[PDB]
Amino acid sequence: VSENFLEKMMALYVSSHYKNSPNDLQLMSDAPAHKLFVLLPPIDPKDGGRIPDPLCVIQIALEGEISKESVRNSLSRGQRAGGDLIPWLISQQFQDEEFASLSGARIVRIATNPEYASMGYGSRAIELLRDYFEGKFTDMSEDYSIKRVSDKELAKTNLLKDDVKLRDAKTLPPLLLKLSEQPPHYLHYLGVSYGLTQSLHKFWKNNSFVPVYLRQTANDLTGEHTCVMLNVLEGRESNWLVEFAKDFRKRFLSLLSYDFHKFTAVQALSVIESSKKAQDLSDDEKHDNKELTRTHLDDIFSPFDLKRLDSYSNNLLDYHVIGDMIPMLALLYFGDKMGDSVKLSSVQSAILLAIGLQRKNIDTIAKELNLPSNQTIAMFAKIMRKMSQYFRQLL
Amino acid sequence: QSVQRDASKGYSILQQTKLFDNIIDLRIKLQKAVIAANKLPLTTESWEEAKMDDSEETKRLLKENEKLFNNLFNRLINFRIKFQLGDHITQNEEVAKHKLSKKRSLKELYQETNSLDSELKEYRTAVLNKWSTKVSSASGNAALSNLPADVQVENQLSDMSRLMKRTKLNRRNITPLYFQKDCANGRLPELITENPYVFDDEDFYRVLLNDLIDKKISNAKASKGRKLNYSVQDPIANYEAPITSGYKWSDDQIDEFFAGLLGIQIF
Amino acid sequence: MSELNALLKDINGSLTATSESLERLSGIYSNSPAEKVSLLSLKNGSMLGYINSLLMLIGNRLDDECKDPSAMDARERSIQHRVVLERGVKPLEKKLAYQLDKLTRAYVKMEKEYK
Amino acid sequence: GISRDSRHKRSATGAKRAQFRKKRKFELGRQPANTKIGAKRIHSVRTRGGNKKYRALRIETGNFSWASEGISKKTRIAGVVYHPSNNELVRTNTLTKAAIVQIDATPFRQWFEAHYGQTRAASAKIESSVESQFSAGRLYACISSRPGQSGRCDGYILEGEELAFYLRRL
Amino acid sequence: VSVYQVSGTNVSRSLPDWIAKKRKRQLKNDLEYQNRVELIQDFEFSEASNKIKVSRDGQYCMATGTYKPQIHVYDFANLSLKFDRHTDAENVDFTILSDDWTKSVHLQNDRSIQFQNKGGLHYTTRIPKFGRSLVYNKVNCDLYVGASGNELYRLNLEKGRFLNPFKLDTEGVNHVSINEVNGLLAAGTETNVVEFWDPRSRSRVSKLYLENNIDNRPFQVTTTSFRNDGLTFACGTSNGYSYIYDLRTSEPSIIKDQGYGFDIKKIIWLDNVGTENKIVTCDKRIAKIWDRLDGKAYASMEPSVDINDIEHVPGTGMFFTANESIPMHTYYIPSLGPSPRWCSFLDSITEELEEKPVYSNYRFITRDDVKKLNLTHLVGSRVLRAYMHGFFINTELYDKVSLIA
């Protein structure tokens, strides 16, 4: 029964993955941090205890709780200890020692049946995950260890007469356990690591995970950049994520032009939005954006530059003449220094982001967004008018 | 088979929940009594003067008054005993049955209330401990080892002084009958706006209303074509051509999804 | 008409219908192995007791003698019963709420299937 | 395309007649004007001769007569309740002659109170069903006009045997 | 959110359009008449419009009139009425079979299905009982007609034969809809039930009993619409309640009520515009845009004149309304999506557009209903904000008070 039930999960696991290696099997059985977890359909009582098929299987790895002393010694030595991927990477990138101490779990893999994809089973499993480690599955009906072979038994057995048999079924716990039965471990966060694809990014964004890091090197096999997304549990402090999200957003915005210019503006916009959702998670106002000051405005842009912007809004200027202001304008708007005054549509933001941060030509935008060049110019000139009004009222 | 136990407990929970809406209705109906009761006199002379205002009238209402409370509260002490018997709160089944059978007096009825409260107090300590341990274990707080609920009750019960002052607050501004006369005559030692004698549970009463309010919302002949002719209508013949690609999903997924339309230890 | 008399009529009208709810409520419970959620049964018995402290509050006031117009004995019990409800039960059931919602829906689904 | 010629019809003996000649203007036909309730859209039609026809596409008010009291008032139309020919016209609330409809009782009620000084007595007596309709506030009326010809939705209040007939049909 | 009326009568609601025609010659001197811009030439019916539909190609649109009953065809590329064709009877429903306007089927109120080819009227067939809706199955090419009676009519274009009719448990079909990804059909019965039928076979897959706790009044299923995702399903009731069901589960995921207690004339899923979790619900007076998941109202559409139909141009923030007015109104909401290709410079003039903006947010309750709910005491309070004859209340409070009554 275990063999049959065992086969069924990898049938789900291997199908999602492209080219699986047998080594992962040894990882899953022997390594302690990994826990084996399955979503099943409702069990019909008339089926007589027959095992249902696995609809979704998720692979988690408990990571974190690293001794604070070990962090400096490894960080100073530049040596990465085996395992605990997310604590090491985040600590290295943000140089934060407290995060490594935090207890968390990495969703190593999620597998859903290809025929049933897009039906929401994966979202349901994660939504039930985040409840389990949050403690919402408490026991309501008013042990699971197995005795190990004793040294006495080993000493008393001779090689020739060894009766190696399957463990008695009575000793064995059940193959599947209800959540209320098994208490969870105390965790601070759920993290993932995956190549940034629109479907997957859309999938995890709906699951309230927020971005913390994106590798600048694309994976050679896939040509894709791995994105690290994180979700904090209720009842736990949430600040450190918010600071990380802001830094990643600033890091992402600036770095759009180097190597993510290949990314679609819609894809880039989603990443920025997902990060901004993290701010909305924080009801606290201690960490908030600062509105652009008049003095800072004067430093960034000269008066003639402001006159130049105004003329374009009035249409007395050519588009090329205003090419100077674009990257600063994109940074300040997406930096949110513009404030509540200035808001834009998703297409409008994508256009501004692309010229400002993906740095693409307006015609390049036209083909990408499937809009003729004139609308992009006209829709853009609308963008410049609103900020020019915003600058005017500030003055 | 575990579905049967799960279903049965849900019924118990449901029966358990309905019981409150019935009792909360009892409290709601009693709300007019507590308001009117708070408006009553306070001192013996005021009662007599209230009696002297209309002597013969005040008598039968007082008798009609007194008779009902003995009937209400005696039935209630019977009403209380059977629960704590049935819900295992009281372990002495024989004593509870004896109390139910016998007819009790006002002073004796007070004694049962004290015992019923006291027995329920031990039940609180045992109950609140068990679930707090369970929830702590379920949430990983056991792994961590946010006060225990019983401890919170004990500590705030220790803060006993603060909570009268909340009760003594006269939010409704109730003035009991002949209050000014009692005040002038110095017949009210406690006083010598917060009134020690006026009881105000309005904030609590509203909360149960809101809670009951919130609960239910979530729960809540051949001619003219008049007969059918199947023959070929040539003008419409071959008006279009069928699309062989079919529906986007596979037939197996299709015929499946309609079926679900609208509804060694293995386990 | 005297103020006391109109007040006394209100109490009389107040009581007589608190009865019919009481017999009606006692009838249905007596009508009811099924094991009950022992946390809730406490959250029953406490707020039964709260209503009773309100009744001894009423009774102590009504006595023409009023040795205890403040009815302090009725006060403390009302405090104790309200104390347990607001801070002992209320946070605990919130942690407990979701699975209770999952159990009751399961029973409802089963009953709909049976019918 | 609409024609009233009997030639396209086959003979009494059943013989299928051959097309004598092309369709003529003088034996032309026009569509039904499907009048409905609402803010009074109408237009004219130029018919044979210099004459004209008015086509009420929509109308919400009409001149209805209380024959028993011998009066007539303009009142708003509530909605179609029954049409003997086709119930679909009732669903579509299409206004047509003989259609049973509901109308406001405010002007008739006010006139009754004015003339009779009652909400003399013997004359004030009327049928019981009509009194019930007054209490309800709406009256069953029959359209006596052809809105698709004259542009008017004139009618009369149902009473007596006809009222009972249309009530039992209801 | 910013919503713009591109075209249509801009006079007070009580003022009729034909009076404005008299005013037009008076105001020829006024500048605003010159500045006013039309989108499609002759985008008006002499009296009124019933239904509006856009070609899947997206360069053409189809509409029908009251007098004379027309079938207007407007070329978006040409911004003009492509042609005018008169019809014998008033049209009840129609669908465009072809990619272009060439091949269409129109269900007339005279119980006749009339087929138009690019040249003209091809053939007229007569169904046994009067029809309430018409839907076309692309896979099987069979026209299914809802009817007043229980039986639902089946006509097969391929064979030119009328095939056997589906038999329904109840009488009155009102609206019918087909899922393009499943093929499942929902028939909106007069009673508070919708029957689900297998297209491949001849079978009722299931029947869903709609339930409304708020109102005990009987209600009828007015409209039915499938999503392209194919798992979510929407229902419109005569009482102004819109139900979105994940068809796999019996319970309604979200219940949204329009406000005015009137029939839901149409439901449109705004998947293609972007931010797919958006749904349009249309009543005779208002067409509201709201999120399927949150239920929050995003934008509201309030023409002065009643709506008979609503149509959305795919991939754009453009909507067309078939209405009672002589000019059919035309709405552009920039936020949802870009203007159509043919509407290249609509963006340039957004300031010049009207930019029309409580009623969508709040719950309209007539004076009589206030009496029914015993809310007379709250008249004059901030809780009840009186507009017109109805006292506007919060939706949550309405569901509250209804449960007491």
PDB file of C-alpha atoms in Angstrom, chain E residues 50-51 64 89-94 106-112 130-134 308:
ATOM      1  CA  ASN E  50     -33.304  47.206 -28.426  1.00  0.00           C
ATOM      2  CA  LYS E  51     -30.033  45.247 -28.668  1.00  0.00           C
ATOM      3  CA  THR E  64     -31.929  47.016 -34.299  1.00  0.00           C
ATOM      4  CA  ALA E  89     -41.479  42.756 -37.117  1.00  0.00           C
ATOM      5  CA  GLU E  90     -39.655  44.042 -34.060  1.00  0.00           C
ATOM      6  CA  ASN E  91     -36.601  41.959 -33.184  1.00  0.00           C
ATOM      7  CA  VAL E  92     -36.369  40.256 -29.801  1.00  0.00           C
ATOM      8  CA  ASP E  93     -32.886  38.760 -30.091  1.00  0.00           C
ATOM      9  CA  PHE E  94     -30.116  38.171 -32.601  1.00  0.00           C
ATOM     10  CA  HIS E 106     -32.585  37.447 -35.579  1.00  0.00           C
ATOM     11  CA  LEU E 107     -35.407  36.235 -33.326  1.00  0.00           C
ATOM     12  CA  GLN E 108     -38.486  38.381 -33.930  1.00  0.00           C
ATOM     13  CA  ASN E 109     -41.423  38.936 -31.579  1.00  0.00           C
ATOM     14  CA  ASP E 110     -43.727  37.358 -34.181  1.00  0.00           C
ATOM     15  CA  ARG E 111     -42.223  33.960 -33.246  1.00  0.00           C
ATOM     16  CA  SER E 112     -40.252  33.899 -36.523  1.00  0.00           C
ATOM     17  CA  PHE E 130     -42.685  32.503 -28.940  1.00  0.00           C
ATOM     18  CA  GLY E 131     -38.993  32.783 -28.158  1.00  0.00           C
ATOM     19  CA  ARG E 132     -37.290  34.606 -25.295  1.00  0.00           C
ATOM     20  CA  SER E 133     -33.631  34.259 -26.322  1.00  0.00           C
ATOM     21  CA  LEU E 134     -31.348  32.782 -28.973  1.00  0.00           C
ATOM     22  CA  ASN E 308     -32.116  47.757 -23.034  1.00  0.00           C
TER      23      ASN E 308
END
